Structures are given as C-alpha cells and as structure tokens.
Amino acid sequence: GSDFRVGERVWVNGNKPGFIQFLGETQFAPGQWAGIVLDEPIGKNDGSVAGVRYFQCEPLKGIFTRPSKMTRK
C-alpha cells in the first residue's frame, strides 16, 4: 500500500527482523536493493560491500536483499 522508507521495521524471508538503513541501486548488482541492519548477528556485512559503503552497522548485522524478499507486519 505504501513504499518502503528508511527507518522502517521489516522482516526478511525467514522472519528475520531488522530496520531499513538503505534503499536504492548499488554497485555490486543491478536493480533495487534494501540495506538492512538485523536484530541478530546472522548477517554478512557492516553495511559495506567490496570497500563501498552504503550504510553502517555491526559486521554481522548487515545484509542487502531484494525488497521483494522482505515484508511488514
């Protein structure tokens, strides 16, 4: 009903909660991406990929996902 916004609480596939820290295109892949800081350290990065920073968080709490792979509740 409404587009995602920075700061929104989201649930990534598998029902992993996090907050949106980045939205848009990135250098590592085409299309739209969502940079999320997860509640749990089950992520893959600190908000950067290949030395390029999109956002910042603990090294194991950041992940980038397609907006289609996350939902609100």
Side-chain angles (χ1 to χ4, degrees):
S2 64
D3 210 356
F4 284 125
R5 299 181 183 180
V6 169
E8 281 185 351
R9 176 68 159 174
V10 291
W11 301 75
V12 183
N13 279 180
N15 215 52
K16 317 292 193 172
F19 286 93
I20 302 176
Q21 293 296 80
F22 176 88
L23 289 173
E25 293 183 292
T26 66
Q27 298 187 192
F28 62 76
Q32 291 291 142
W33 290 87
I36 302 167
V37 54
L38 301 173
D39 282 18
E40 310 277 61
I42 60 183
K44 299 180 182 180
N45 60 61
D46 71 337
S48 64
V49 176
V52 177
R53 187 167 294 289
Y54 302 88
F55 67 98
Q56 177 184 310
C57 62
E58 310 186 19
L60 302 304
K61 290 190 170 186
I63 66 169
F64 287 86
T65 182
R66 290 296 196 183
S68 64
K69 294 190 170 185
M70 62 191 209
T71 63
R72 296 163 168 141
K73 285 185 180 175

